[PDB]
RNA sequence: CCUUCUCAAACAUUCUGUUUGGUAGUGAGUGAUACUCUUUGGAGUUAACUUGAAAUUGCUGGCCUUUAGGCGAACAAUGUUCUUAAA
């Protein structure tokens, strides 16, 4: 997680005031008298699911504290269905920093520049390896058996 | 069942004996630390291993850094089966060159040279060329 | 609060965006209700200019900034300036806490101690929060009585620093003042030119000097990067002289106090 | 391959527009007065201060 | 130095002994198969006992990269040219002016790329590596030049032609276009490098066989080999094709005759340095 | 319905560089930043000759 | 508990450290036996950084000069070596946010290109060195009776007359002039006024203070610049600024 | 979870030219043609090619100074030491 978001944190996407001056910028200088694309994480959960369908993203990370939490149920499956790298990472707060926002229930990575395409997919190896290979058996179980002491002491026990 | 011994691999640059050696002595006492390194310069083959005393550490070691991502690379670290001791792990350093020779006296060095020169010319006959002096 | 989650969300843009559009209180209305009239200005200016040349000699530490410790000295620095360039100085008394200077402002008897110009040690035990407060209302009242008195007297406010006698000694005698006696201390010295030896303090004897109408020439001053041709006088404070050159009058610091 | 065969529209490749708009839109504001330069701004905030 | 007839005879047995008598694309054996090269010993290393990471310039009659980039249409790998350059003289020069300037003599620097483009994008080993084998020649800032090693790697230095070359680019200590322009003209079509070896033989790359004409060829040689007989204490001189036995072209033996207390202590500038920075002198001398 | 000042400066460049050439003008990276077809380069470079000659 | 990216980290830069050290010192060494034949650059440069920067690249004289050198933390996840340590002990420079009076001369020359990361140094003016002996003044004197290591500051006079009165030093002033003069006493009172305490231009980690120290770490990018290559110039610097700052 | 030697001279005016010096690399693995020396043990060189920053253990090279350093530096030389990059 403190891996992801140093690739993350590089692509946030520019602010209201920052926009609104580089804009003003080039106003100023087409008032007296050939660029790349940019480079941003993608945001929203309509965006970020029409780009997942499509296979346009590279690795999706997704809240895990969503409140209507049927707004992300179908997120992991979809992403494992369409071959997407997905993470769940932990805080929709932290994810809006990264964006600009207070809150965002999801993050995304579509083009990245090509001195971070190296770390991007090493990025998605590690995710691999830690996340889906790890949980992918027990991700299917039931959970939430937790047993208190009061309750462990009269019934494992007898 | 398992050994005390953890190979690790796919290490950083400057991570070597004495790092190795001092980050896993924090999982429990070590008793060697070896790393594979080039004999011609010393130079890190990016894996080594290493034993711990208790051979209950050994599993704690490797669960914890078995995909860990350290300077853009992800930690290989696993427990060896029972026995598979670990061996002829030398640290090598860079080897310098030495300039000595010239035993030969300089009469018969430079009479050589006549007869490599003959010797040479006569070889490339046999070779579909023909070269003259 | 704001600039606190502006940091914290690792915004750093924002943060200093935020920070160029603030303004602080100003506290000149009050300092015109506490005091209705210059006069009772220049009644409060005793423990102003107290508070304001202790700060004056301080070192810059974690709570007092030096930004903080360069305004006092440059205020005492311009009110030393103004009372040398109109001999204004009444009485003098050196004691072993610092020197006392009382000078004579529109007809208003001012007082102020100066400490000598030595290391300090700083207490723990003392709470700067409250030094802080009391030195930013002195600071701004010194700053509107100074202006008042440089611009009734007809001078040039704020005055000039001279950048490359501020190098050498930088003290009041930095400060040039610019334009658009009635007392006999105001006139002694008239005709002297003392020679300042290194032994004594020049910060507290070229004022006394200058504000009683003579000239000096500092021998501290000639240690950077003349040849006493009109010096009259000499103070001293070595236990025994060297040259003892025919004409001048040699002097302990106390003649002049 | 995706779900879907929508084609692949053309502001995808190309600059901006919405923006090229606002662009223009703050020209033509900075050539009638409304916004005043940074440069010119700039200037203003080193002048009265003191 | 060396006779012209025997320079002449020798490349014409090359010509003749390099082609005697399925597949689409020509194998690395058969591709570079004509390649020429002329091998000179010295006794004792050339460049003594360190590593010489730069690249001796040696003049040539004929242009070497001309009919190399003429040739290179018919290839699979085009012949680019990068151009690296200093931070600050990256934004002086544009693709423009050096097309203005470079066009009207056949010569184009197909990449410009700065130091800090080595440590961004190219970092990866195997992204380095992809951009850096796809040139034929490199010319480097003459201020860069010394610590592009560790930015370029050491994959890139084991050849002749992925190592770069110092040309100057300022005039009176300042970027001047003028001065670029002609170094790489100069190196382009008046020049050839050859990597210098702390060991005893050293190999030089003429070109391919099918570049040049066998007396283009022979005016070389008879120049690189007058070149290096000056500079050096060159031994033995041969030539050959890649795979091919070695030709001899000069032999010379005359060569092998060179093969057989109180305050003041004495103390080190080191030491003599740091006794003046403390009065305790307490130096354990003896 | 007249043009504007930077579309007359845009088709400038493009006439002075390339002419009639609507093929290349087509295939300019530099001069048809917004990637337009053949057709509207040829259209609106024919209303600018118009009104200039 | 030591992640193993902090040991990684201290290993490759103390490395690189090291091998810079190791550069400046063979280029010495060639220099000083006048062996100047496949070295770099023969000539002892000195680079003048004065704020709309500028900057002066000018050979250094033999002439003597005054120098104040400043203790500023060095270069991040390096441990020190063996060499810079030993010729900041000796400069009694250990402790950051710390100055100390040098005369600059034609052997303390290399030793400036040792320990470069680790100081800022520049020329001091007259009023810069009466301000800082007068407002941190430090001494090594004798307690009640026993404890010697008090460290006191020089209030008085009489303890100045009482050390260096047989010199000829009597009072605070005339060590300031001992040292704006370079005099025949300069090493004398130099080793007893010890290292000067200095004020750290930001202190505090409130938004207020943290946003001061990002300001400020990024001017320092820009004013204090190392080459870490064997021919750098020695940096010098507006020292009265920054005193300045830290006064 | 650090970030890489980004140049110096000497001569001469053809908005610049000539000469000299400065460059130590990720590891592993294919692969010839040839050269020099040799204590005949291999030491230094010579085309070309593959690759996620890839990895499963090559007995111990030699000389010098020691209590790890130099051979790219010899009356020469060695990080776990800065701590407001704090909590």
Not at chain 1, 106 to 130: F, M, P, Q, Y
Not at chain 5, 149 to 158: D, I, Q, T, V
Not at chain 7, 102 to 122: C, D, E, R, S
Request: with cysteine; glycine share 4%.
């Amino acid at each position: 997680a403190a891996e992801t978001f140093k690739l993350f944190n590089k692509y946030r996407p520019e602010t209201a005031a920052e926009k609104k001056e580089r804009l003003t910028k080039e106003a100023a200088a087409v008032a007296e008298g050939a660029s790349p694309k940019p480079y941003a994480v993608k945001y929203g959960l309509n965006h970020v699911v029409a780009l997942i369908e499509n296979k346009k993203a590279k690795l999706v990370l997704i809240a895990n504290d969503v409140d209507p939490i049927e707004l992300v149920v179908f997120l992991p499956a979809l992403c494992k269905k369409m071959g997407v790298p997905y993470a769940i990472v932990k805080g929709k707060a932290r994810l809006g920093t990264l964006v600009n926002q207070k809150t965002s229930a999801v993050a995304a990575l579509t083009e990245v520049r090509a001195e971070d395409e190296a770390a991007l997919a090493k990025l998605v190896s590690t995710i691999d390896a830690n996340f889906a290979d790890k949980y992918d058996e027990v991700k299917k179980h039931w959970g939430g058996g937790i047993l208190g002491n009061k309750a462990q002491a009269k019934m494992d026990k007898r | 069942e398992y050994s005390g011994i953890i190979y690790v691999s796919r290490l950083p640059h400057g991570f070597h004996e004495k790092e190795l050696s001092k980050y896993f002595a924090q999982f429990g006492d070590l008793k060697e630390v070896r790393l594979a390194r080039n004999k011609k310069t010393g130079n890190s083959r990016h894996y080594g291993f290493l034993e711990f005393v208790n051979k209950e550490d050994a599993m704690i070691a490797q669960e914890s850094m078995n995909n860990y991502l350290l300077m853009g690379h992800l930690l290989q670290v696993r427990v060896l089966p029972k026995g598979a001791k670990i061996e002829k792990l030398y640290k090598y350093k860079k080897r310098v060159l030495v300039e000595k020779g010239i035993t030969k006296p300089v009469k018969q060095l430079k009479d050589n040279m006549k007869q490599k020169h003959e010797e040479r010319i006569k070889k490339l006959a046999k070779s579909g060329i023909e070269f003259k002096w | 609060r704001k600039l606190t989650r502006a940091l914290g969300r690792g915004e750093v843009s924002s943060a200093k965006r935020l920070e160029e559009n603030r303004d602080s209180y100003t506290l000149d209305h009050i300092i015109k209700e506490r005091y209705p009239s210059f006069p009772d200005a220049i009644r409060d200016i005793d423990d102003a200019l107290n508070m304001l040349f202790l700060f004056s000699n301080l070192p810059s530490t974690n709570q007092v900034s030096s930004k903080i410790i360069n305004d006092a000295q440059k205020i005492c620095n311009q009110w030393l300036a103004y009372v040398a360039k109109e001999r204004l100085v009444r009485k003098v008394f050196v004691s072993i806490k610092g020197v006392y200077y009382q000078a004579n402002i529109k007809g208003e008897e001012v007082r102020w101690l100066v400490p000598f110009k030595f290391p300090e040690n700083i207490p723990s035990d003392v709470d700067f929060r409250i030094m802080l407060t009391f030195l930013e209302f002195y600071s701004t009242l010194l700053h509107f009585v100074l202006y008042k008195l440089y611009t009734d007297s007809g001078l040039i406010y704020p005055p000039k620093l001279d950048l490359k006698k501020d190098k050498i000694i930088s003290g009041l005698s930095s400060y040039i003042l610019e334009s658009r006696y009635d007392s006999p201390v105001a006139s002694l010295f008239s005709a002297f030119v003392f020679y300042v030896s290194r032994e004594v303090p020049i910060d507290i004897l070229e004022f006394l000097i200058l504000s009683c109408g003579g000239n000096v020439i500092s021998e501290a001053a000639m240690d950077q990067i003349i040849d006493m041709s009109k010096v009259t006088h000499q103070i001293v404070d070595r236990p025994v002289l060297k040259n003892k050159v025919a004409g001048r009058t040699y002097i302990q610091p106390q003649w002049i106090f | 391959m995706p779900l879907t065969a929508v084609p692949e529209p053309k502001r995808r490749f190309v600059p901006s527009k919405n923006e090229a708009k606002r662009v223009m839109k703050i020209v033509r504001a900075i050539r009638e007065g409304r916004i005043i330069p940074p440069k010119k701004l700039k200037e203003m905030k080193e002048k009265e201060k003191i | 130095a060396i006779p012209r007839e025997r320079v002449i005879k020798a490349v014409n047995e090359l010509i003749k002994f390099t082609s005697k008598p399925k597949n689409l694309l020509e194998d690395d054996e058969e591709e570079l198969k004509k390649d020429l090269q002329l091998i000179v010993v010295n006794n004792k290393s050339f460049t003594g006992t360190s590593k010489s990471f730069k690249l001796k310039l040696l003049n040539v009659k004929h242009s070497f990269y001309k009919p190399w980039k003429e040739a290179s249409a018919t290839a699979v790998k085009d012949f680019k040219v990068l151009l690296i350059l200093k931070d600050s003289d990256i934004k002086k020069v544009s693709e423009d002016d050096l097309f203005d300037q470079l066009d009207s003599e056949g010569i184009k620097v197909d990449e410009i790329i700065c130091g800090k483009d080595l440590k961004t994008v190219y970092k990866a080993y195997e992204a380095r590596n992809a951009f850096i084998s796809q040139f034929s020649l490199i010319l480097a800032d003459d201020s860069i030049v010394t610590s592009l090693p560790k930015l370029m790697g050491g994959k890139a230095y084991n050849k002749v032609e992925t190592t770069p070359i110092s040309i100057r680019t300022h005039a009176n200590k300042e970027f001047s276009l003028t001065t670029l322009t002609n170094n790489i003209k100069k190196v382009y079509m008046n020049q050839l490098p050859v990597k210098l070896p702390r060991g005893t033989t050293l190999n030089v790359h003429l070109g391919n066989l099918e570049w040049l004409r066998p007396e283009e060829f022979v005016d070389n040689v008879e120049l690189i080999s007058e070149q290096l007989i000056k500079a050096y204490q060159i031994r033995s001189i041969f030539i050959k094709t890649n795979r091919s036995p070695v030709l001899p072209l000069y032999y010379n033996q005359d060569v092998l005759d060179e093969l057989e207390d109180g305050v003041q202590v004495h103390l080190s500038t080191f030491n003599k340095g740091l006794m003046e920075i403390a009065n305790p002198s307490e130096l354990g001398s003896i | 319905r007249s043009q504007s000042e930077r579309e007359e400066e845009w088709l400038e460049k493009l006439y002075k560089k390339h002419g009639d050439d609507y093929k290349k003008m087509f295939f300019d990276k530099k001069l048809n930043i917004y990637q337009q077809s053949e057709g509207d380069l040829k259209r609106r470079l024919l209303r600018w000759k118009k009104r200039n000659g | 508990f030591v992640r193993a990216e902090s040991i990684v980290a201290k290993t490759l830069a103390t490395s690189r450290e090291k091998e810079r050290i190791k550069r400046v010192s063979i280029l010495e060494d060639k220099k000083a036996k006048n062996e100047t034949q496949h070295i770099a650059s023969g000539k002892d440069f000195i680079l003048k950084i004065t704020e709309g920067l500028i900057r002066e690249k000018t050979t250094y004289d033999g002439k003597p000069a005054l120098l104040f050198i400043v203790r500023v933390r060095g270069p991040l996840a390096v441990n020190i070596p063996n060499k810079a340590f030993k010729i900041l002990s000796l400069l009694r420079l250990v402790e950051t946010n710390t100055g100390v009076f040098v005369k600059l001369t034609k052997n303390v020359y290399p030793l400036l290109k040792v320990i470069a990361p680790y100081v800022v140094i520049g020329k001091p003016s007259l009023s810069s060195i009466r301000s800082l002996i007068q407002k941190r003044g430090r001494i090594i004197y004798k307690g009640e009776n026993e404890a010697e290591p008090h460290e006191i500051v020089l209030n008085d006079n009489n303890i100045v007359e009482e050390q260096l009165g047989d010199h000829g030093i009597i009072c605070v002033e005339d060590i300031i002039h001992e040292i704006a003069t370079m005099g025949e006493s300069f090493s004398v009172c130099n080793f007893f006024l010890q290292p000067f305490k200095l004020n750290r231009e930001v202190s505090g980690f409130g938004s207020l203070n943290r946003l001061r120290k990002i300001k400020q770490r990024e001017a320092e990018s820009r004013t204090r610049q190392f080459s870490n290559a064997a021919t750098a110039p020695v940096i010098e610097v507006d020292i009265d600024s920054l005193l300045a700052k830290l006064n």
